[PDB]
Amino acid sequence: AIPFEALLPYGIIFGLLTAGGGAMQVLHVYRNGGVRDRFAIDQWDSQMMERDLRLNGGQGRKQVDQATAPEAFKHNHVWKSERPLI
Amino acid sequence: TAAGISLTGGRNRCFSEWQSFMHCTAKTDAKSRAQCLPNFEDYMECLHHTKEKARLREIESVLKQKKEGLEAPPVKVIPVKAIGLV
Amino acid sequence: MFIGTIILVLSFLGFVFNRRNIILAFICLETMLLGINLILLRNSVLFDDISGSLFAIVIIILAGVESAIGLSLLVSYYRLRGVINSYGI
Amino acid sequence: LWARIYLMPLLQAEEDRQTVRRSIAQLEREKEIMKGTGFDVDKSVYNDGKFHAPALMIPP
Amino acid sequence: PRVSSSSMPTDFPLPSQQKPNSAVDYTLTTLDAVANWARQGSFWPVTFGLACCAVEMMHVSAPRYDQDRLGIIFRASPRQSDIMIVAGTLTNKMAPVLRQVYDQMPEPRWVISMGSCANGGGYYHFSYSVVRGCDRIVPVDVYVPGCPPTSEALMYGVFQLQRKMRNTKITRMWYRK
Amino acid sequence: MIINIVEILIFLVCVLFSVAYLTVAERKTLAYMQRRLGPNFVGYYGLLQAFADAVKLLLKEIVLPKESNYIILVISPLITLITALIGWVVIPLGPGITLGELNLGILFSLAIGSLGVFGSLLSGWSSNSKYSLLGSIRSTAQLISYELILTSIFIIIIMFVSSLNITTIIETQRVVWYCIPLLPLLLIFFIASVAETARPPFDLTESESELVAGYFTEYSGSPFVFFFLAEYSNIILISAFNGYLLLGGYLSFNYSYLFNILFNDYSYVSFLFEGLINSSAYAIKLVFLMFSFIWVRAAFPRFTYDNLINFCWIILLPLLFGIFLIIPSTLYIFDSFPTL
Amino acid sequence: MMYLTYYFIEITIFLAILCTIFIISAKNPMVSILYMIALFVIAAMYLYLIGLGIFSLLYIMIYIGAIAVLFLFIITLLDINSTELSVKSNIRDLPLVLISLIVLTISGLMIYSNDSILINKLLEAFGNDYNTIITQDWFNIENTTLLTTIGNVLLTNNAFILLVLAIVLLLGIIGPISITMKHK
Amino acid sequence: MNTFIIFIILIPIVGFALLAVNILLAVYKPYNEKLGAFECGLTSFNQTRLAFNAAFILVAILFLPFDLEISTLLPYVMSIYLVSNYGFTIVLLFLLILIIGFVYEINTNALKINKHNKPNTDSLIYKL
Amino acid sequence: RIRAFTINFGPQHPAAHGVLRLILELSGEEIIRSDPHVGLLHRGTEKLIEYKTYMQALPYFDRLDYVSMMTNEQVFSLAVEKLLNVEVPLRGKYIRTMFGEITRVLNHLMSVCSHAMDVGALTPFLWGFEEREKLMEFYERVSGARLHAAYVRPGGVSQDLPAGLLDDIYMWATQFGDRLDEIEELLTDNRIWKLRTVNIGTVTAQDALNLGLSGPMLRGSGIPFDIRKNAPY
Amino acid sequence: PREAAAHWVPFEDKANMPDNVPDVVEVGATSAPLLSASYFIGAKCKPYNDDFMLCREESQGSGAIDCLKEGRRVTRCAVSVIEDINKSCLDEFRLHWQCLEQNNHQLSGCRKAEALLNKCVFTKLNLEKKIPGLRPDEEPVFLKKDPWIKPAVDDFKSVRAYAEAKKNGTL
Numbered sequence A: 001a002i003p004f005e006a007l008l009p010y011g012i013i014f015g016l017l018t019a020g021g022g023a024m025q026v027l028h029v030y031r032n033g034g035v036r037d038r039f040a041i042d043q044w045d046s047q048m049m050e051r052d053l054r055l056n057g058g059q060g061r062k063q064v065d066q067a068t069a070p071e072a073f074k075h076n077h078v079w080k081s082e083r084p085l086i
Numbered sequence B: 001t002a003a004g005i006s007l008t009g010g011r012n013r014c015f016s017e018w019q020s021f022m023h024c025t026a027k028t029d030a031k032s033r034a035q036c037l038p039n040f041e042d043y044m045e046c047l048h049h050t051k052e053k054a055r056l057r058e059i060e061s062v063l064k065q066k067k068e069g070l071e072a073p074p075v076k077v078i079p080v081k082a083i084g085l086v
Numbered sequence C: 001m002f003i004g005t006i007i008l009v010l011s012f013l014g015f016v017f018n019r020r021n022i023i024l025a026f027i028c029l030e031t032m033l034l035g036i037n038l039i040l041l042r043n044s045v046l047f048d049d050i051s052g053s054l055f056a057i058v059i060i061i062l063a064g065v066e067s068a069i070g071l072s073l074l075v076s077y078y079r080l081r082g083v084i085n086s087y088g089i
Numbered sequence D: 001l002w003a004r005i006y007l008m009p010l011l012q013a014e015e016d017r018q019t020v021r022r023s024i025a026q027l028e029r030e031k032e033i034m035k036g037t038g039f040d041v042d043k044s045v046y047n048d049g050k051f052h053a054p055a056l057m058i059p060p
Numbered sequence E: 001p002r003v004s005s006s007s008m009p010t011d012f013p014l015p016s017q018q019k020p021n022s023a024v025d026y027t028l029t030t031l032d033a034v035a036n037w038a039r040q041g042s043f044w045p046v047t048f049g050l051a052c053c054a055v056e057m058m059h060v061s062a063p064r065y066d067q068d069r070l071g072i073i074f075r076a077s078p079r080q081s082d083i084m085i086v087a088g089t090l091t092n093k094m095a096p097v098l099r100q101v102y103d104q105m106p107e108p109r110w111v112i113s114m115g116s117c118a119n120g121g122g123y124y125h126f127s128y129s130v131v132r133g134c135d136r137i138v139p140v141d142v143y144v145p146g147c148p149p150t151s152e153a154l155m156y157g158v159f160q161l162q163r164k165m166r167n168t169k170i171t172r173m174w175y176r177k
Numbered sequence F: 001m002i003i004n005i006v007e008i009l010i011f012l013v014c015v016l017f018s019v020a021y022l023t024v025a026e027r028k029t030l031a032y033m034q035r036r037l038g039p040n041f042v043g044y045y046g047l048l049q050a051f052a053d054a055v056k057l058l059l060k061e062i063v064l065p066k067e068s069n070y071i072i073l074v075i076s077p078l079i080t081l082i083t084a085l086i087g088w089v090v091i092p093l094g095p096g097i098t099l100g101e102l103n104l105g106i107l108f109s110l111a112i113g114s115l116g117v118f119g120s121l122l123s124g125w126s127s128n129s130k131y132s133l134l135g136s137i138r139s140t141a142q143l144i145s146y147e148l149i150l151t152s153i154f155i156i157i158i159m160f161v162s163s164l165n166i167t168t169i170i171e172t173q174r175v176v177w178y179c180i181p182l183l184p185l186l187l188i189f190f191i192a193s194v195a196e197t198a199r200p201p202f203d204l205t206e207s208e209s210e211l212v213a214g215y216f217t218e219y220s221g222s223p224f225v226f227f228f229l230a231e232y233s234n235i236i237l238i239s240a241f242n243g244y245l246l247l248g249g250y251l252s253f254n255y256s257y258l259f260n261i262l263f264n265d266y267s268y269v270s271f272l273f274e275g276l277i278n279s280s281a282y283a284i285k286l287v288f289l290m291f292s293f294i295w296v297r298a299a300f301p302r303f304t305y306d307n308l309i310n311f312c313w314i315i316l317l318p319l320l321f322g323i324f325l326i327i328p329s330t331l332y333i334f335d336s337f338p339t340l
Numbered sequence G: 001m002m003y004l005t006y007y008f009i010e011i012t013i014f015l016a017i018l019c020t021i022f023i024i025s026a027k028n029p030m031v032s033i034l035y036m037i038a039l040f041v042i043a044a045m046y047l048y049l050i051g052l053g054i055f056s057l058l059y060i061m062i063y064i065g066a067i068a069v070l071f072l073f074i075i076t077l078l079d080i081n082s083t084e085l086s087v088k089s090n091i092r093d094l095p096l097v098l099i100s101l102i103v104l105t106i107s108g109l110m111i112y113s114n115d116s117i118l119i120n121k122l123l124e125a126f127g128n129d130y131n132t133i134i135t136q137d138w139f140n141i142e143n144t145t146l147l148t149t150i151g152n153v154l155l156t157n158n159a160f161i162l163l164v165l166a167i168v169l170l171l172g173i174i175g176p177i178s179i180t181m182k183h184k
Numbered sequence H: 001m002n003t004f005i006i007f008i009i010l011i012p013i014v015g016f017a018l019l020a021v022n023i024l025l026a027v028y029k030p031y032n033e034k035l036g037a038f039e040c041g042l043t044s045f046n047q048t049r050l051a052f053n054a055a056f057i058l059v060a061i062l063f064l065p066f067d068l069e070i071s072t073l074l075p076y077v078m079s080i081y082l083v084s085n086y087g088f089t090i091v092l093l094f095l096l097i098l099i100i101g102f103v104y105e106i107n108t109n110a111l112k113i114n115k116h117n118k119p120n121t122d123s124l125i126y127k128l
Numbered sequence I: 001r002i003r004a005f006t007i008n009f010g011p012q013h014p015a016a017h018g019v020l021r022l023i024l025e026l027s028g029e030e031i032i033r034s035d036p037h038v039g040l041l042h043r044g045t046e047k048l049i050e051y052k053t054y055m056q057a058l059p060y061f062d063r064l065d066y067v068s069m070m071t072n073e074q075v076f077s078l079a080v081e082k083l084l085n086v087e088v089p090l091r092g093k094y095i096r097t098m099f100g101e102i103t104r105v106l107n108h109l110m111s112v113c114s115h116a117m118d119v120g121a122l123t124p125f126l127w128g129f130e131e132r133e134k135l136m137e138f139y140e141r142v143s144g145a146r147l148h149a150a151y152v153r154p155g156g157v158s159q160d161l162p163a164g165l166l167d168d169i170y171m172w173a174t175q176f177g178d179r180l181d182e183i184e185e186l187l188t189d190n191r192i193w194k195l196r197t198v199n200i201g202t203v204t205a206q207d208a209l210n211l212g213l214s215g216p217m218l219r220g221s222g223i224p225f226d227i228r229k230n231a232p233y
Numbered sequence J: 001p002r003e004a005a006a007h008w009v010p011f012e013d014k015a016n017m018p019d020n021v022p023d024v025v026e027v028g029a030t031s032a033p034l035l036s037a038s039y040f041i042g043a044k045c046k047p048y049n050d051d052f053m054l055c056r057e058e059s060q061g062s063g064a065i066d067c068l069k070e071g072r073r074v075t076r077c078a079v080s081v082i083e084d085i086n087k088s089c090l091d092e093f094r095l096h097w098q099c100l101e102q103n104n105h106q107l108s109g110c111r112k113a114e115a116l117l118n119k120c121v122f123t124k125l126n127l128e129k130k131i132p133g134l135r136p137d138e139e140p141v142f143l144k145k146d147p148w149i150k151p152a153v154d155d156f157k158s159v160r161a162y163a164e165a166k167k168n169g170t171l
C-alpha cells in the first residue's frame, strides 16, 4: 500500500510552498493595482515607466490612452542630480 | 580595439569631440597639426569638465556673496515618489 | 580615485614594511591589484567607455592565474624545507 | 525592435524639446545671478559653436 | 546592618509535593513542560557498545522496535549526545576512556547502565580485570537488568528515564531558590 | 513597506518550515524503505519531531574546546547558514513572483553558492587538530571540484537563453523543459548536487574520517543547529536550481482553456488560482527532487575520496567540455542563436 | 536615509582603510586572510554603488570563491611561522612610513591632473563639488548590458586577446603541474 | 528598501537571535576534562604538520584556472547572437586551446594518489 | 626521513566498534604501520573457567563471539564429550547441526550487514535484522533466551524442541531465499560496492596459511578447506 | 547614457519654453497604448520621422536646437494617428493595450485582440501593420497560426470578442 504517514511531511512542505506562492502572487497583484508584475525590464522599460508616472499623476502603473497630454506634463520633467562618484 | 564603444555597445560619452579632432588630425600634417588645438581642447573638456567646474566655482562664489533676492524660474527638488504628483 | 588609491598605497606599504610573514606579502599583492581595478572601473563609468571594463576583466583573469602560480611556487619552496620562516623567501 | 524604432522619433523629439527648455532656463538663471559683475554667462566653454547642454549642476 | 529578623515559613512543601497555584506557578509549569517535552522527544544517546549487550541495542533500532519512531538517534560524538548508554562489560583498561567520554558530554546529561556487567560486573564480577559496576566511574540514572536485557527491557528503561525527565523541575526549581 | 514586510515574513516562514519538515520527511521515507515507521510519536504522526530536536538543541550547552578559536567556531556555521538562506531571495514561484527580481539572478545564485565552501574550510581551523585539518581539506576539495560541474551546466543552459534573469529562463521553457533535449545533463546535475551538498554517497568527511562525525564533531547547541539547517536548506535550494534550469520551474501545463471556462474576467480569485497552480508545480518538482536525495541515500554505499575526485575530474569534466563544444555547434548548424 | 545613503561611498572608503590596517596588523595570518575577504566585500559594495553590480558579483565569484579559498587551503596545509607587530620590530619604520604615505598619496592624486602648476595639480584632486546631470535619450532599442558588451568586444574586436588569455590559462595549468608533481 | 534588501538584513538577525537564545538559556559549566578535544575517548600527542600528497595541493590549485576558463564563457553566452558566427568560431578556438591543457592534466595523471606500497611480483629463483 | 602521522582509530568510533584501539601510522594517505591495541574487553574468562565446573563454565562460551552463541557452546561441548568418551544421541546431533546452521545464518546476517553499514550501505542492516529477529524467536522458544541460550551442553541439548517449531522453521525457510536475493540486488553487482571491495585486503594462499587465517579468510584465497567436510562432527 | 548612480535626486525645471519657439501638443498616451499604436504611427509618420532623424544627423551636434520644427511635425503626426484611433477603433485598441498590461508588454500574449485592432485600423484608417526587412519566404510572426510561444492565460475579454467577431464575420 501507499504509506500515508510517510507522505504527510511531503504534503506539509508542498502545501506550505503552494500557499506561500499563492499569497505572494496576490500580494504582488495588489501592489500593482490589479495587473501582473513586470519582469526582465531593461533601461527602455524603466524610462517608459517613469514617463508613465509623469502622465498618469503618479498613480504607479496606471495607463492613459488619450492622444494629447495635460498641461502639467510640460513642466513635470525630471532630470537626476547625481552625487560626484569619488 | 574597443575605442569609441560605450558601456552599451554604442558611442561613448565624448565620441563626437574625439571624432571631430580625428577628422582634424587626418586633414592636417605635422607642421599644420597645431591648427587642431581647439578640437583637442574640446575633447579634453568633455573628458574632464575642467573649464565647466571653474565657471561653476565662479558663479557659486558670486552667489554665496549675495544677499539680494533672485527672481527667475527656479529649480525644484522632489522625492522620487512625487514624480508626477499634483 | 580615492578608495582605489588608498587601497593601493596602503597595500604597497604593508608589502614593503612587512616583517611578519610571507602570506601578508601574497595578500598585499592581491589587494594592490584590487585597488588598481577599482580606479579603472570608476574611470570606465565616468567615460561610459567599455575599454576600461575590458581591461578590468583581463586583470581579474590574470590575477587568478598569478595567484595559482605564486602558490605553486610557495609549495615547491616548502617541499625542500618543510617550514616557512618569517623571512621565508 | 521595430515597434521601438517607430516610437523612437516622438520620444526623442519630446526629450529634445525639454533639453532646449531647461538649458535656456539655466542660462537665464545664471546670467541673472551674475548681473552686476564682469563675466559673460553666454560664452561656451567649448570652442566649436555647437549646442552643449550643461553637465555638472550646483548641488540643490 | 539593617534586616534583623525573618518571616520564613515552617511548613513550605517539598519539591515532590508542591503543586501550582499562582499562575506564575502555572507559567513556570508550562515552560518546564515544554523543555521536558523536548528532552523526551529528542533523545540522542552516545553508545558505549562494549559487548553482547550492544547487540540488543542494535535490535532496538531494527525494524521490529524502531527506536527512531520515538525520536531516538544514536550519535558518534559525545558533543552531540544527551544520554550515555553503558552496554557491556567495563574493564579496568577501559575505565578512564569511559570517564573521558562521559566528561565531554554537554549538559544536561544522563547515563543508563544496561546489563549485569555494567550494572555490577555480572558473570565477570570476580575478575582481576573488570570494574564491578560502571557506577564506580560515572553517576547512573537508570539500571536495566538482564544478561542481556531484551530490546523491550531496554525500551522500558528508556521510558523510565523519560519519566524522570518529565518530572524534572527546572524553572520551578529556580523559583524555589 | 507593510506589504514588503508581510511578503518577506510569508516567504521566510514557508522556507524555514519546509526545511524543518524535510528532516522529518527524510526520517520517515528512509524508515519505510527500511520496513520501519520513523517518527510517529513526537506530535501527532510525528509531526512535531523537528521542533523537538530544535528546542532540545537550543537548550544544550555550547562547548568551546581548549585549543579552539572560539569566535571562528561560532561564526563559521553562522555564515554558512546565512549564505544558504540568502540564496532563496531569487527563487520565483511564478512570473516575477520573487523577493528579488534581479536581471543578474543567475550570477547571484552562482556567487552565493561559491560562498558555500567556507564552513568546511573554517571549521577545521576552529580547533588545533590535524585530523580536523585533513578532513576539512578533503571536504573542501570535493566541494570546489563539483562546483565546477554545476557552473558548467549553468553556462550550458544559458547558451539556450542568453539571459541571467531566472524568470526569463523559466519562461523560455514553455516550449519544452530543458531536461528533454539535455536529459544527460539532468542526470549529471543531480549527481553533482548530491556531491556538492556532501550527501551520501558523497559523504566521506562525516562517515569515513579521523574524527568520528566530520568537522561538526566538536559542535554542540546552536552551532550544530546552524550546520544542520544550512545543510537541509542547501538541499532544497540546489534542487530549486535544478528545477528552474532543467525542469521548467513553476510551469506545469497550459491552463488557458480551463481558466477561460472558470472565469470571465480578472479577479483576485483568478490571480490566486493561477498563483496556486504555478507554486504547486514548482513545489511538486522540489518534492520529487528531495525524495530522490533520500532515495539515493537509501540505496547506495559511499565513495572514497580518490574515487570521487576521479569521477569529477576524469569522467564528468571531459564530458562537460565536449558538451561545451557540441551545443553552440548545434545552434550554429540550425541558425538558432538565442537573441537577448 | 539621505545622510547615511549620501555617504555610503565615504563609509566604504573608511571601512577599506580600516580593513587594510587590520589585514596588516592581524596576529594569525588566517585572520589576515579573513580581513582580505572583508576588504573584497567592501570593494563589491563600492562597485555596486557606482553602478557595476555585475562586477560586484564577479568579484565575489572569483576573488572570494576561488582565490581566497586557495589562500585558506594553502595556509591550512602549510606550516607558517609569523611574528607579531611590536615596537621593537616595527617602530623603526615609522619615519619612512610617514614620508612614504604623504609622498605616494599626494603623487597618486596628482598624476590625474593636466595643470602646469604643481599646487594646482594637487588641488584639482579635491575639486568635485558638483553633481552630474543624468539625462535620458531613446537611441538604444536593444537590451544590451555591460556583460553583453564585454562579450561583444572580447569575442570580435579583441578576439586575439581572448586567445592569448587562453594561452595564459594553459600556463596556469602546465606550470603548477611541472613544479608540484614529480614525474616517474 | 525593497524586499531584497530587507530579506538580506533579516537573515543574519535571525541567526544571531537563535545564538543569543542558546547563550541565554543553556547552562555553561566548562571544566578541564570537558574542554578536551574529542578523539575517540583518548588523547594524542601534538605533532608536526602531516606530510601531505601533492594531489591535495593540485586539486585546489587547478580549480582556479579551470574555474576562470568556465567563467570566461559568461560574456560569450550573454553575447552569442550579436557575435554569431565569427564569435562562435573564436569561442571554439578558445575551448580547444583549454582542452589541450585538460589533455596534459589527464595524461600526466596529475590528480592520482598512487598507493606507494604495491604487492611484490618478483619471481622466486633458487641458485641450485 | 619519512615521518609518520599517528591516529587512534577508536575505541569510541563507529567503525572501531567501541572497543578496538587501532593505532595507525599514515604517510599522507597510506597506512605504513598498524598496531591494534586490544584487551579493552579482556574479562579474564580463561581464569574464571578454572574455578567453575564444566557445566558452570558452559555459559562463558555464549559470551565469546556473542552473535554465534550456539556454535561456541558446540565447540566446548564437543571437547568435553571427547574427554568424557560419551556419544550424543542422534536427535541431539541433528538439533545441534540445525541450530548450528541457524546460528551461522544469524552470524552472517550480522557480519555482512555490519560490513555494508561500515562502507555506507545502510539499508541491508535493517532488512537483515528483521530476519535475525525471526531466528531469535526460535532461539528463545527452545532455550528461553534471545542471545545467551546455554542450550548446547556436553551430552546433547538441555531440552527437547517444543511442539510447533519444525513447522515454523520451515515457513521461515520458504521466504528466506527471497530475503537473500534482495540484499544481493543491492550489493552483488553494484559498481560502488565493487569499488570498495575488489582487490581490497588481498591475501595470498601461502600467506593465509602462514598467518593462521581460517574460514572465509582462507577459502577466499582458493584453498578448499572446511572442517564440516574435512573432519565431520 | 548611463542610469544614475549611488545617490541622486530628481529635480524639475519651472521655466517656460522661450516664446520664440512655436508651441506644440504633446503625446498623451502611456507605454501600453503607445506600444499598441506603434506600428500604425510608423506607417503614417515614416517620412516625418526620417526627416527628423536626417536633420539631427546633418546638424552634427546641435540637433536638439536645430530640429525643433521637424520634431514639432513628428509629434503632431503621432497625435493625429492616436486621435484617429480614439475616434474610430477605441474598444479594440483598449482591448489590446489592457491585454498588454496583463502580459508584461509582450505582443505574443495578445494576438486575438491585435487581430481585431488591425482589422479595424485597416478598414477605417487605411494603415497596415508590416514588419520591415523580411524576405517573401519569411513569414511575419504576428501573422503566424499555431505559434510555438503562447500566453499562459488567453485574455478573457479578448477571447470573447474574438469569438464574437468570428460569428459576425468581421474576422
Ligand code: SF4
Pocket (backbone or CB within 6 Å): E051, E052, E053, E054, E087, E088, E089, E114, E115, E116, E117, E118, E122, E123, E146, E147, E148, E149, I063, I066
Ligand atoms: S550483561 Fe550479559 S549480554 Fe550484556 S555484555 Fe555482559 S555478558 Fe554480554
